[PDB]
Amino acid sequence: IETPITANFREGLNVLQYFISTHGARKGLADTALKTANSGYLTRRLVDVA
């Protein structure tokens, strides 16, 4: 996005900057579970082959 979140977590955010940061928060939270599942599958295959 063009305009960045200028304020920090001490000065307190407004509505829209918090709403923007929610996107990254949710994306990271979902990617955690997805990469966990993929790593588990890869580990199982690697343990089997050797």
Partner: protein, 1340 residues
């Protein structure tokens, strides 16, 4: 201010003046079910709509019909509490007046032969409790709304699925409310196809032909015609100038005598403009231009009579020569381009192998039902029923609206089925999207998703039951007798009841209630699930629907969702978000007019929100006039930017409208990170209610609304003066202005005392008002489990120091002092229900008696003569609750005990021990024993005493109700008669009951006197009838499960205190586990001598980015310092003026705070009561995104005589030294989550085994063993750990001989294993042999 908040006024730091109050938080469910039940004859909603959509019904001939008249709901047999106790559904009988009219066949229209109408009984629809909850089979269930894709038409495109080409493929889709689907799509070669119900593909011109369209009509509908004229062996065209854009001049664009274009030049826009400024129409051409064009209409010679060229073939030199020598001087051709007018319909017709309509019907027949021999009538019926039938196709008038909106029509209404023009328009729009005009639609856009509530779903299921019974009745009516067949004798109530019961008991949406605190119930009823019937699944969703869309602003909270696999499928509705009439989500907005932000509020949907310009909620105003700044930040079309002060069109109603109920209770939400805010919002609904509820020092102001609207307190319906206060009930006398001249004016609020909740927690109602208090309407009288004077109080506020301490706070772990455990601040009550059923075995009934064998008096000291523990007796683990005894059976009988069976009596050694005991670790008193019996068998002395107590309590409390209400009525009669005349002493010299026969001349006041007497007589009559009904209801036997004699239900009440292992958390997601209970003398203590109750860990602050906890800590210290000053002043007993001055000074400290409270209005007693209520600390309201700042909290700290930095000097309690750095100290509001170590810990040595695999079971409830999964096997393998792996695979698992040998040897002290072949391997061998493939263990 009302009198319920004058007791304790929460100071508010908000600066935005709120215009719109928070609405009723449970409006969606109540409104939906009210629409479903209530009779709306015009706006057909719920039952009436389905009844009109099914009835009337004809026979296959049409000589007998059933006419709908009306319907009504009967009164429920049992009450809500009665149904909860008995475990039956709280439902209302549905009686429908149905009329059967019979027709003659001899007459043309013999409508009047016989009419028969009556009340047929069908179905028992469940009713909704006053809090939006259903009672099914005793349990309390909640039906959540569903956000599902709207009916209508959606144009989409796949972003380069075919990687080889990289082209964009567009596809349309027509989604009806119920019926078959329809999918228009393209291919890499740019041909358009139809998929019906996501089946195989055909060229899409098949549908056009099936709609009775020939090729010439198709080409007329899609392509527009260019006119080629042959005259005296030369060619001209009629040319419309706005067609040569982006093309290269293949020939010379000439005029009658003017030259315009040369070879190798593209017709640029300025040349086109020259063309419209020269006004030329007819343009001559050479012959090679036609070669490449396609003829529009067929051409047949009038002489020879055969077609030289039909529609849609590529014209060449030979064909045009033949047509010219034929004599057709005018040629119509389709116009084609490569950028704006593409030849797709012609290509699809070329690839199409079908000639006319019947072949198209044959082809669609072979699609839909492959392998079946086609026939004309079958194909016609299937095609007319796929789309053009009112019973197998419907858009429900909401798909119609979106359909006409997406196609840019005008009317929002129309037929419920598809039509020719609809298909033509949708495919034309698809063609235009392909060309470049228009844009595809978003799936996650909130303008395409609809809220389907409980009423709609119940209506649909009821309609399914109705069509089932309708098909049945139509079948039966057509062949059976018609004269003496009552309309009620065909209709079976079984299918409708089955449908509604299945929906209400076994759906994916009617789920168990989470009601461990009011906040959980509120956030559960305001829930939107994207899954369910007709929805997504956890596999059908990717990152596109789980993620936040810009249209969720104000409609759906972005920071309240489960953090597991349901990260984006379970959303929470916002605060001010209502629902549209169609089901769309809309938000309030303050309408601005030429600069003034008026108080007018408009509700806007998602599609309208993107049109205007919306101002932010944090914009300052001048005396509720114009904006202050000139460049206001605003949002439009989904993006945020800056705009002028005159370009705006709306403003956000409040700063709280973005977040939901749960996230709006967290103070300083704007400083917390998104992840920790999400975790705090998720953990706030798992807080167990404590013994004594305590208010939070730092609130938000939303606590009161959540407490009131949760339906868990006892709000006053009508204001008045409280008459009688008790721990069980409240008797209130209403004021004169709010009281009907019909009633007495006395209201009774009963209080629920110690009722088990769904999550095994206690529910209690403690009265908060005292005797002699005037209370108006809307005041709370009884606090619920987690309420304190009408404010939600989930946890306790405690002293906290942020400092590492000897490693006991290492990774989120928490150290707690002994003051917390001595004061039982986190001591909870857990009511647990145990059930014992006396089954009817195949050798005799199971008796409950005190004659349990092989048990001494040490275990029977709590049992009475009937074998049931006395109420109030404390019971520990392993003790006997009920002495149920069961026969063993001849198989379980040994010859030794068979001889004494026929000598020393039958009741000697026939039965065994099957009594109910306590699960290990559980203790506590017995509080309630319920004995349900089957109708027909005498119960015991105990159940007779139980029913005697029940009848005595019912008669007593109901008689007291009558006595109080009649006393109020007689008081009203006295007041009325002294309002009429002057009679004071003559009333009190005569008995109170004899106040009715006195009178004088008749007038209006005598009229309501007589009305009051009539109400008295009706009162006593209803008293007698309800008493008799209650007595009959309790004296009769319950309907139990088949094969069941009697059921004994025992309620135990454990008292749980905290111990190492219990989870705690704040409101900012700083969860942790208790590590140690520390004596008070070791706690780090401040200068005054007060030790800190809990020591947290500072390192959780920077890495998790939740600074809201530090600010809450400082604010709590400031509030508690002010409260401590108040308490010191009160203890010194100074004055009334000084306390008034100090409290007023503390209240008016903010810069531009919204509220204005003044103490001059309050009297001395109100001031004293307020000071008493604030002596424990002044509550503070900090709204989300508009809360207090650092300057205000520092001013509070200064007023309370505390250091401004918030850090004080601590001394080490163990040694007495001074810590080298000041330590942040303050009061934080901690909860106590429902993950207790008592329910988590479990151990097992040897127990029961499964049947097929013969390995130990799994589960704490059934005493199972821990699974040793595949990963741990790999780990032990990696160590090289052979022996441990073998012993965990054979002798500690499914190998019967090995494990019993292991037990025998370990009991004998020798530590050795004797492994064997596991049973699971033989199970596998037998299964694979049953597969028919020979496997065997090959010896050597």
């Amino acid at each position: 201010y009302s009198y319920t908040e004058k007791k304790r006024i929460r100071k508010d730091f908000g600066k935005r003046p709120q215009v719109l109050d928070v609405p009723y938080l449970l409006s969606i469910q109540l409104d939906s079910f009210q629409k479903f039940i209530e009779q709306d004859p015009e706006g057909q909603y719920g039952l009436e709509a389905a009844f009109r959509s099914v009835f009337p019904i004809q026979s296959y001939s049409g000589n007998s019909e059933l006419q709908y008249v009306s319907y009504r709901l009967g009164e429920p047999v049992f009450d809500v509490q009665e149904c909860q106790i008995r475990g039956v559904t709280y439902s209302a009988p549905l009686r429908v007046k149905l009329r059967l009219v019979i027709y003659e066949r001899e007459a043309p229209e013999g409508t009047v032969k016989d009419i028969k109408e009556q009340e047929v009984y069908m179905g028992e629809i469940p009713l909704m409790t006053d809090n939006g909850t259903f009672v099914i089979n005793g349990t309390e269930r909640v039906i959540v709304s569903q956000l599902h894709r709207s009916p209508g038409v959606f144009f989409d495109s796949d972003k380069g699925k075919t990687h080889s080409s990289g082209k964009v493929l567009y596809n349309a889709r027509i989604i009806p409310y119920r019926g078959s689907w329809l999918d228009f799509e393209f291919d890499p070669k740019d041909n358009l196809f139809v998929r019906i119900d996501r089946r195989r593909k055909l060229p899409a011109t098949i549908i056009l032909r099936a709609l009775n369209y020939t090729t010439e009509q198709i080409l007329d509908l899609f392509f527009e015609k260019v006119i080629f004229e042959i005259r005296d062996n030369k060619l001209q065209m009629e040319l419309v100038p706005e067609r040569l854009r982006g093309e290269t001049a293949s020939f010379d664009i000439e005029a009658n005598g003017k030259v315009y274009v040369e070879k190798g030049r593209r017709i640029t826009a300025r040349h086109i403009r020259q063309l419209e400024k020269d006004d030329v129409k007819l343009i001559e051409v050479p012959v090679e231009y036609i070669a490449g064009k396609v003829v529009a209409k067929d051409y047949i010679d009038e002489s020879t009579g055969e077609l030289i060229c039909a529609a849609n073939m590529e014209l060449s030199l030979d064909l045009l020569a033949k047509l010219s020598q034929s004599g057709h001087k005018r040629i119509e051709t389709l116009f084609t381009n490569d950028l704006d007018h593409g030849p797709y319909i012609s290509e699809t017709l070329r690839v199409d192998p079908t000639n006319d309509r019947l072949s198209a019907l044959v082809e669609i027949y072979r699609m839909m039902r492959p392998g079946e021999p086609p026939t004309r009538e079958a194909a016609e019926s299937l095609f007319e029923n796929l789309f053009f039938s009112e019973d197998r196709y419907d858009l429900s008038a909401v798909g119609r609206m979106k359909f006409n909106r997406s196609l840019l029509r005008e009317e929002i209404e129309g037929s419920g089925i598809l039509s020719k023009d609809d298909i033509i328009d949708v495919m034309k729009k698809l063609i235009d999207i392909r060309n470049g005009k228009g844009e595809v639609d978003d799936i996650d856009h909130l303008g395409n998703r609809r809220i389907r509530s409980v009423g709609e779903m119940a209506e649909n299921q009821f309609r399914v039951g109705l069509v089932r019974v309708e098909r049945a009745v139509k079948e039966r009516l057509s062949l059976g007798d018609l004269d003496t067949l009552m309309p009620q004798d065909m209709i079976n109530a079984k299918p409708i009841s089955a449908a509604v019961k299945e929906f209400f008991g076994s759906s994916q949406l009617s789920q168990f209630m989470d009601q461990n605190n009011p906040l959980s119930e509120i956030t559960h009823k305001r829930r939107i699930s994207a899954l369910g019937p007709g929805g997504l699944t956890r596999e059908r969703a990717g990152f596109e629907v789980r993620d936040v869309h810009p249209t969720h602003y104000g409609r759906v909270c972005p920071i309240e969702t489960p953090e597991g696999p349901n990260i984006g499928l379970i959303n929470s509705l916002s605060v001010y978000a209502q629902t549209n009439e169609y089901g769309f989500l809309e938000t309030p907005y303050r309408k601005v007019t030429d600069g003034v932000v008026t108080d007018e509020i408009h509700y806007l949907s998602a599609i309208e929100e993107g049109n205007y310009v919306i101002a932010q909620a944090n914009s300052n105003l001048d005396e509720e006039g114009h904006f202050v700044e000139d460049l206001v930040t605003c949002r439009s079309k989904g993006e945020s930017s800056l705009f002028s002060r005159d370009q705006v069109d709306y403003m956000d109603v409040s700063t709280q409208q973005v977040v939901s109920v749960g996230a709006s209770l967290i103070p300083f939400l704007e400083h917390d990170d998104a992840n920790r805010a999400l975790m705090g919002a998720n953990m706030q609904r798992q807080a167990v209610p404590t013994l004594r509820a305590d208010k939070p020092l730092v609130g938000t102001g939303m606590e009161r609304a959540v407490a009131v609207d949760s339906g868990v307190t006892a709000v006053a319906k009508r204001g008045g003066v409280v008459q009688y206060v008790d721990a069980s009930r409240i008797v209130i006398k209403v004021n004169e202005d709010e009281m009907y001249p019909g009633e007495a004016g006395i209201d009774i609020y009963n209080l629920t005392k110690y009722t088990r909740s769904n999550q095994n927690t206690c529910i209690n109602q403690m009265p908060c008002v005292s005797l002699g208090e005037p209370v108006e309407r809307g005041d709370v009288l009884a606090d619920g489990p987690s309420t304190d004077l009408g404010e939600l109080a989930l946890g306790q506020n405690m002293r906290v120091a942020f400092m590492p301490w000897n490693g006991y706070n290492f990774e989120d772990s928490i150290l707690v002092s002994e003051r917390v455990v001595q004061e039982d601040r986190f001591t909870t009550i857990h009511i647990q229900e145990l059930a014992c059923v006396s089954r009817d075995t195949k050798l005799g009934p199971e008796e409950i008696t005190a004659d349990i064998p092989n048990v001494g008096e040490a275990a029977l000291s709590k049992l009475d003569e009937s074998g049931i523990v006395y109420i109030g007796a404390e019971v520990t683990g392993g003790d006997i609750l009920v002495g149920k005894v069961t026969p063993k059976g001849e198989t379980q009988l040994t010859p030794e005990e068979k001889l004494l069976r026929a000598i020393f009596g039958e009741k000697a050694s026939d039965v065994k021990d099957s009594s109910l005991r306590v699960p290990n670790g559980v203790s506590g008193t017995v509080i309630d024993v319920q004995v349900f019996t089957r109708d027909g068998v005498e119960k015991d002395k105990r159940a007779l005493e139980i029913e005697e107590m029940q009848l005595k309590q019912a008669k007593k409390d109901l008689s007291e109700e009558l006595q109080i209400l009649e006393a109020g009525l007689f008081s009203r009669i006295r007041a009325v008669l002294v309002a009429g005349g002057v009679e004071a002493e003559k009333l009190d010299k005569l008995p109170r009951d004899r106040w009715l026969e006195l009178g004088l001349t008749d007038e209006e006041k005598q009229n309501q006197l007589e009305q009051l007497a009539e109400q008295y007589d009706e009162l006593k009559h209803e008293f007698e009838k309800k008493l008799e009904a209650k007595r009959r209801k309790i004296t009769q036997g319950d309907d139990l499960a088949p094969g069941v004699l009697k059921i004994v239900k025992v309620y135990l009440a454990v008292k749980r205190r905290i111990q190492p292992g219990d989870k705690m958390a704040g409101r900012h997601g700083n969860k942790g586990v208790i590590s140690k209970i520390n004596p008070i003398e070791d706690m780090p203590y401040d200068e005054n001598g007060t030790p800190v109750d809990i020591v947290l860990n500072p390192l959780g602050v920077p890495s998790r980015m939740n600074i809201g906890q530090i600010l809450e800590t400082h604010l709590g210290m400031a509030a508690k310092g002010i409260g401590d000053k108040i308490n010191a002043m009160l203890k010194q007993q100074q004055e009334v003026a000084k306390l008034r001055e100090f409290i007023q000074r503390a209240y008016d400290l903010g810069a531009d705070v919204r509220q204005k409270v003044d103490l001059s209005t309050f009297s001395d007693e109100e001031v004293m009561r307020l000071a008493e209520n604030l002596r424990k600390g002044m509550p503070i309201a900090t709204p989300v995104f508009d809360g207090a700042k650092e300057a205000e909290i520092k001013e509070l700290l200064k007023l309370g005589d505390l250091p401004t930095s918030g850090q004080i000097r601590l001394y080490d309690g163990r040694t007495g030294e001074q810590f080298e750095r000041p330590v942040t100290v303050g009061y934080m509001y901690m909860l106590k989550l429902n993950h207790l170590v008592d329910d988590k810990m479990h151990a097992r040595s040897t127990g029961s085994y499964s049947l097929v695999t013969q390995q130990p079971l799994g589960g704490k409830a059934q005493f199972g063993g821990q699974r040793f999964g595949e990963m741990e096997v790999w780990a032990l393998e990696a160590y090289g750990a052979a022996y441990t792996l073998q012993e965990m695979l054979t002798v500690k698992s499914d190998d019967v001989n090995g494990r019993t040998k292991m037990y025998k040897n370990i009991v004998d002290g020798n530590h050795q294993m004797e492994p064997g072949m596991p049973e699971s391997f033989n199970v596998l061998l037998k299964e694979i042999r049953s597969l028919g493939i020979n496997i065997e263990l090959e010896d050597e």
